[PDB]
Amino acid sequence: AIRYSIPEETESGYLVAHLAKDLGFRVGELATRRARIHHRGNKELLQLDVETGNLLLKEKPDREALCGATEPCVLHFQIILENPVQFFQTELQLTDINDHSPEFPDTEMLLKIQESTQPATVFLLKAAQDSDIGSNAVQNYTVSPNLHFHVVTLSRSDGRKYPELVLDRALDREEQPELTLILTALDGGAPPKSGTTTVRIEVVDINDNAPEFVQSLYSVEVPENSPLDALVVTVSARDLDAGIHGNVAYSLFQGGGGPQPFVIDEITGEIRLKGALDFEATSYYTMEIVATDSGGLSGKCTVAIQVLDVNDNAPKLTISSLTSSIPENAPEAVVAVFSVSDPDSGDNGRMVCSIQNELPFLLKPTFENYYTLAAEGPLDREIREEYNITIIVSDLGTPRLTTQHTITVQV
Amino acid sequence: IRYSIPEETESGYLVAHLAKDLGFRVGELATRRARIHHRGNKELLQLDVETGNLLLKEKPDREALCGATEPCVLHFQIILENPVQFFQTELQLTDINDHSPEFPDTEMLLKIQESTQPATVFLLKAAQDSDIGSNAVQNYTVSPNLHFHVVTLSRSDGRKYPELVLDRALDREEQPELTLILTALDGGAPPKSGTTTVRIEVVDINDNAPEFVQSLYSVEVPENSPLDALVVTVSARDLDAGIHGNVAYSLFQGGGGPQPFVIDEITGEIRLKGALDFEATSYYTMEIVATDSGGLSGKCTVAIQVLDVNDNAPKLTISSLTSSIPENAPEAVVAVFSVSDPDSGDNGRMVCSIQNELPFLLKPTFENYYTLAAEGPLDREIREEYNITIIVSDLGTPRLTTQHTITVQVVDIN
Ligand SMILES: *[C@@H]1O[C@H](CO[C@@H]2O[C@@H](C)[C@@H](O)[C@@H](O)[C@@H]2O)[C@@H](O[C@@H]2O[C@H](CO)[C@@H](O[C@@H]3O[C@H](CO[C@H]4O[C@H](CO)[C@@H](O)[C@H](O)[C@@H]4O)[C@@H](O)[C@H](O)[C@@H]3O)[C@H](O)[C@H]2NC(C)=O)[C@H](O)[C@H]1NC(C)=O
Ligand SMILES: *[C@@H]1O[C@H](CO[C@@H]2O[C@@H](C)[C@@H](O)[C@@H](O)[C@@H]2O)[C@@H](O[C@@H]2O[C@H](CO)[C@@H](O[C@@H]3O[C@H](CO[C@H]4O[C@H](CO)[C@@H](O)[C@H](O)[C@@H]4O)[C@@H](O)[C@H](O)[C@@H]3O)[C@H](O)[C@H]2NC(C)=O)[C@H](O)[C@H]1NC(C)=O
Ligand SMILES: *[C@@H]1O[C@H](CO)[C@@H](O[C@@H]2O[C@H](CO)[C@@H](O)[C@H](O)[C@H]2NC(C)=O)[C@H](O)[C@H]1NC(C)=O
Ligand SMILES: *[C@H]1O[C@H](CO)[C@@H](O)[C@H](O)[C@@H]1O
Ligand SMILES: *[C@H]1O[C@H](CO)[C@@H](O)[C@H](O)[C@@H]1O
Ligand SMILES: *[C@H]1O[C@H](CO)[C@@H](O)[C@H](O)[C@@H]1O
Ligand SMILES: [Ca+2]
Ligand SMILES: [Ca+2]
Ligand SMILES: [Ca+2]
Ligand SMILES: [Ca+2]
Ligand SMILES: [Ca+2]
Ligand SMILES: [Ca+2]
Ligand SMILES: [Ca+2]
Ligand SMILES: [Ca+2]
Ligand SMILES: [Ca+2]
Ligand SMILES: [Ca+2]
Ligand SMILES: [Ca+2]
Ligand SMILES: [Ca+2]
Ligand SMILES: [Ca+2]
Numbered sequence: 001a002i003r004y005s006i007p008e009e010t011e012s013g014y015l016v017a018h019l020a021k022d023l024g025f026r027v028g029e030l031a032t033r034r035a036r037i038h039h040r041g042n043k044e045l046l047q048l049d050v051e052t053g054n055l056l057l058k059e060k061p062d063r064e065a066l067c068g069a070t071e072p073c074v075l076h077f078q079i080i081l082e083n084p085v086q087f088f089q090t091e092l093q094l095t096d097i098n099d100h101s102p103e104f105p106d107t108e109m110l111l112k113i114q115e116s117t118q119p120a121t122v123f124l125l126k127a128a129q130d131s132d133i134g135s136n137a138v139q140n141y142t143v144s145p146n147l148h149f150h151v152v153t154l155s156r157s158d159g160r161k162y163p164e165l166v167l168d169r170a171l172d173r174e175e176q177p178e179l180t181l182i183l184t185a186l187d188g189g190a191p192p193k194s195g196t197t198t199v200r201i202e203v204v205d206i207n208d209n210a211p212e213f214v215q216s217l218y219s220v221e222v223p224e225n226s227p228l229d230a231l232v233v234t235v236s237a238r239d240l241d242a243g244i245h246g247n248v249a250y251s252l253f254q255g256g257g258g259p260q261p262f263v264i265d266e267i268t269g270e271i272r273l274k275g276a277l278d279f280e281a282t283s284y285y286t287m288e289i290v291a292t293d294s295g296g297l298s299g300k301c302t303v304a305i306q307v308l309d310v311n312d313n314a315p316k317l318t319i320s321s322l323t324s325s326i327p328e329n330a331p332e333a334v335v336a337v338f339s340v341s342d343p344d345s346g347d348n349g350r351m352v353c354s355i356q357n358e359l360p361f362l363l364k365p366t367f368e369n370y371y372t373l374a375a376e377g378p379l380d381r382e383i384r385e386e387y388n389i390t391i392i393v394s395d396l397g398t399p400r401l402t403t404q405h406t407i408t409v410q411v
Numbered sequence: 412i413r414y415s416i417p418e419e420t421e422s423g424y425l426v427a428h429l430a431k432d433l434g435f436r437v438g439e440l441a442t443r444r445a446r447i448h449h450r451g452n453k454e455l456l457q458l459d460v461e462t463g464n465l466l467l468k469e470k471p472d473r474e475a476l477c478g479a480t481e482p483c484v485l486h487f488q489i490i491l492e493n494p495v496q497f498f499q500t501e502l503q504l505t506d507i508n509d510h511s512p513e514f515p516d517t518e519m520l521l522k523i524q525e526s527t528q529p530a531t532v533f534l535l536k537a538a539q540d541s542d543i544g545s546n547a548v549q550n551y552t553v554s555p556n557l558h559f560h561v562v563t564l565s566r567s568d569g570r571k572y573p574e575l576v577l578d579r580a581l582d583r584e585e586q587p588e589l590t591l592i593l594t595a596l597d598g599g600a601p602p603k604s605g606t607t608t609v610r611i612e613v614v615d616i617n618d619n620a621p622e623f624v625q626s627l628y629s630v631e632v633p634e635n636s637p638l639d640a641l642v643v644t645v646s647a648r649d650l651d652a653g654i655h656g657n658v659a660y661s662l663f664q665g666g667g668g669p670q671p672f673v674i675d676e677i678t679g680e681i682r683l684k685g686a687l688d689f690e691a692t693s694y695y696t697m698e699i700v701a702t703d704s705g706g707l708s709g710k711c712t713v714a715i716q717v718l719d720v721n722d723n724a725p726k727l728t729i730s731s732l733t734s735s736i737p738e739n740a741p742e743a744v745v746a747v748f749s750v751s752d753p754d755s756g757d758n759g760r761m762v763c764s765i766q767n768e769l770p771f772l773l774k775p776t777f778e779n780y781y782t783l784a785a786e787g788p789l790d791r792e793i794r795e796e797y798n799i800t801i802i803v804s805d806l807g808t809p810r811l812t813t814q815h816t817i818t819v820q821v822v823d824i825n
């Protein structure tokens with residue numbers, strides 16, 4: 001019927017309006033009829049000065065405590081006249097004034113966002129509480145300047161607006177494990193009121209980096225007489241990831257052809273012998289060590305073992321042709337034809353054989369490791385009844401191995 | 412002079428005719444006491460000088476006399492005594508397929524994550540074969556499957572190894588693990604087989620966001636519920652397992668106004684954090700979010716409607732009052748009063764009563780505004796005074812009452 005508007009939190013005793021003038025009767029009538037104003041329920045904000053016919057405040061009106069969310073804030077008062085009994089209805093509209101700053105319930109919010117999160121994905125954040133409404137309510141959301149994210153204020157929901165976080169640039173834990181941002185709520189009033197809170201984003205480690213080997217190739221040499229438990233070479237790999245995505249499993253791939261006496265440890269990556277070696281049998285070993293991640297990522301390296309020849313085999317002497325007894329007057333007579341063989345390699349397999357120089361016999365080097373023992377020129381029967389001959393062959397290895405065979409020739 | 416014979420040929424078999432090839436008669440060989448000599452190890456060959464023939468003495472094993480090195484050639488020197496003469500002859504052993512492809516491990520374990528991209532290659536152990544060339548491993552086949560296929564790489568100095576290739580993406584949610592049969596095919600005729608079991612274990616990754624059982628929750632709670640009261644329990648399920656399957660629950664209240672609601676991360680139980688009041692807040696709307704330990708999230712809406720309990724009794728206020736009433740006054744007004752009830756529904760609807768026998772009656776002027784008045788002129792002599800008691804009561808359950816007593820003295824003008 002009759003509505004007057006006044007701002008919120010107006011000081012007590014302030015004049016609201018002229019009731020007598022607007023309603024259409026003299027002050028004398030109000031004084032005579034003992035006019036009194038009554039709010040129907042709670043405490044009365046208004047007083048009616050009947051001496052002047054004016055309507056003024058008694059108490060400071062708080063919008064957020066008398067209306068709250070409901071808008072517009074209108075209070076209903078009934079002014080009464082005694083004789084005759086008469087009622088007039090008057091309404092008081094409280095204008096909202098920005099007397100509350102946006103504030104966040106929690107000082108800091110923790111977020112866990114996995115490394116493998118795709119861009120344009122949206123996250124929901126807690127909102128700043130504001131008692132005020134309309135233009136005096138929360139109107140904007142701004143985040144501290146950063147490369148990865150940006151903040152968008154969504155005006156959804158029945159009332160007010162909430163903050164949403166949007167990702168534009170893909171995340172990587174290897175560069176930044178965690179990020180820290182400053183979230184600020186800006187009021188719509190003039191001047192705006194601030195409200196800050198800390199946003200803590202924790203990047204979750206995922207398996208996106210394959211284990212890589214420190215060294216691409218390993219070349220190590222091992223003697224053929226090494227014990228069964230001997231450390232050949234230890235290979236290692238590093239993973240950029242952490243946790244179960246950072247643990248590395250080592251397994252070996254031997255060559256397609258021929259079994260190998262090598263075994264590797266899953267954890268340490270130590271390559272040890274699983275059997276005995278032999279340079280004469282296998283001169284070289286080539287294999288590939290693979291490091292598989294606990295997720296599935298793998299990195300491969302090549303390992304080449306060159307065995308070292310040890311002079312473990314002594315010269316072998318074999319008799320091809322021999323003459324049990326020798327003539328007396330035979331010139332350039334051939335006693336025996338023998339050969340030497342050495343399975344070892346290098347100068348360990350090169351042989352030299354010797355005989356007593358005092359003896360009339362001499363061996364002539366015929367072919368490759370092929371010699372013939374013979375007597376040069378005629379011999380005497382009376383002078384020598386018999387000959388015990390022992391030829392001793394030795395290699396040029398380290399150490400030197402010797403072999404001797406005894407033969408007795410009767411002239 | 413080189414002669415060729417297959418590996419593992421039975422002892423005593425004739426290798427070749429030396430006399431013919433070298434170019435002299437058998438008699439010369441017999442006369443000179445011709446003897447054949449292997450330079451080093453045991454001798455496979457024997458030279459029968461009675462026929463001038465060359466024959467085996469022992470069964471030749473390629474893999475034990477040559478091994479990897481090819482061609483397998485043995486060097487012999489044949490000797491003639493008088494005069495002393497040397498002729499060099501060589502024996503080439505042809506490899507025969509007498510070894511079946513075999514795998515070192517009976518079964519191989521692979522771990523391939525669910526998020527594995529197609530065309531990615533994995534390395535598998537190779538089947539060991541003693542033979543070489545065409546008699547070695549020549550082909551690799553895998554048991555027919557939807558996801559993978561096998562490719563044989565001819566890398567390494569010798570022979571070829573098996574590689575596994577992925578063509579169709581993997582999902583742990585459909586199939587947790589796969590089992591395949593790897594077979595190594597020899598090149599010889601007929602080919603020899605060699606099988607092994609391949610077990611692929613798919614590793615769980617975070618690719619499924621937690622989803623809520625019900626999109627919306629409607630629950631009602633009285634305004635006088637204790638601080639520790641179970642309002643509603645919300646739950647969500649995650650397809651993933653392990654840490655990718657664990658769910659964290661947190662609530663989002665409205666932008667405006669604080670709420671007395673608190674949520675548990677684990678149980679998803681929404682409980683009161685304070686007291687309620689229907690007169691203050693009639694409705695609550697919030698959003699429950701389920702965040703994964705990886706970062707994936709699922710959202711639902713929860714709306715709680717509080718129920719008004721008739722906890723407030725009617726309030727009676729006197730606006731205007733007259734202590735005493737004239738004698739011959741017609742329709743005289745004793746008082747003007749009002750009633751107020753903060754409750755809602757029939758809990759806030761009020762009815763007020765007075766003794767009907769009394770001449771006075773209350774007239775309903777406005778909404779919960781009444782005026783007490785006397786019906787007709789009154790007489791002084793009959794009644795010196797009146798005890799009046801107005802009783803106002805709401806229509807709620809239970810009914811709350813409030814009463815005010817006023818005593819009016821009817822006085823004549825004189
Ligand atoms: C290694 O072995 C695999 C499979 O081995 C087979 O299975 C084992 C158990 C043995 O039985 C082997 O004998 C088998 O070969 C080979 O891969 C595939 O082999 C299959 C054989 O069935 C091929 O499928 C066939 O494709 C035919 C179509 O061929 C058309 O094109 C050719 C081109 O030359 C032409 O000649 C022909 O006339 C057709 O026009 C089809 O008709 C037939 O029914 C059958 O389905 C398949 O194509 C082979 N795939 C590949 C990728 O090779 C490998 O070839 C083998 N590798 C070697 C020997 O090196
Ligand atoms: C003015 O009149 C009122 C109303 O009394 C009625 O009207 C008068 C004209 C007569 O006709 C009375 O007979 C009528 O009852 C008087 O109020 C009454 O007071 C008496 C004395 O205390 C009450 O009687 C007692 O009440 C005790 C308490 O009752 C309470 O509980 C009931 C519900 O169970 C509740 O309604 C009431 O308001 C009390 O809260 C009780 O323990 C005791 O046994 C006895 O019954 C009588 O109940 C009152 N009336 C009513 C309607 O309750 C005023 O006293 C009187 N004025 C003066 C100055 O005396
Ligand atoms: C929130 O406040 C900012 C002021 O910091 C408004 O300005 C935006 O950002 C910069 C200011 O540094 C301007 O250069 C841009 O042009 C503004 N962006 C847009 C989209 O206009 C920003 O507009 C405010 N947000 C809202 C929703 O009003
Ligand atoms: C709110 O207040 C802060 C200071 O507390 C300002 O930095 C901001 O711009 C806004 O005015
Ligand atoms: C918001 O940010 C300010 C600094 O800009 C702090 O002082 C305040 O406590 C809140 O964290
Ligand atoms: C060896 O033998 C298997 C059966 O045992 C065959 O499937 C294979 O193709 C090869 O002939
Ligand atoms: Ca205020
Ligand atoms: Ca305000
Ligand atoms: Ca504000
Ligand atoms: Ca990365
Ligand atoms: Ca990794
Ligand atoms: Ca990572
Ligand atoms: Ca050796
Ligand atoms: Ca050696
Ligand atoms: Ca030697
Ligand atoms: Ca063999
Ligand atoms: Ca063979
Ligand atoms: Ca074979
Ligand atoms: Ca999946």
Ligand SMILES: [Ca+2]
Nearest residue numbers: 619651655703
């Ligand atoms: Ca999940």
Ligand SMILES: [Ca+2]
Nearest residue numbers: 583615616651
């Ligand atoms: Ca999964």
Ligand SMILES: [Ca+2]
Nearest residue numbers: 688689690722
């Ligand atoms: Ca209440």
Ligand SMILES: [Ca+2]
Nearest residue numbers: 719720721722
């Ligand atoms: Ca209530």
Ligand SMILES: [Ca+2]
Nearest residue numbers: 723754758805
């Ligand atoms: Ca009530």
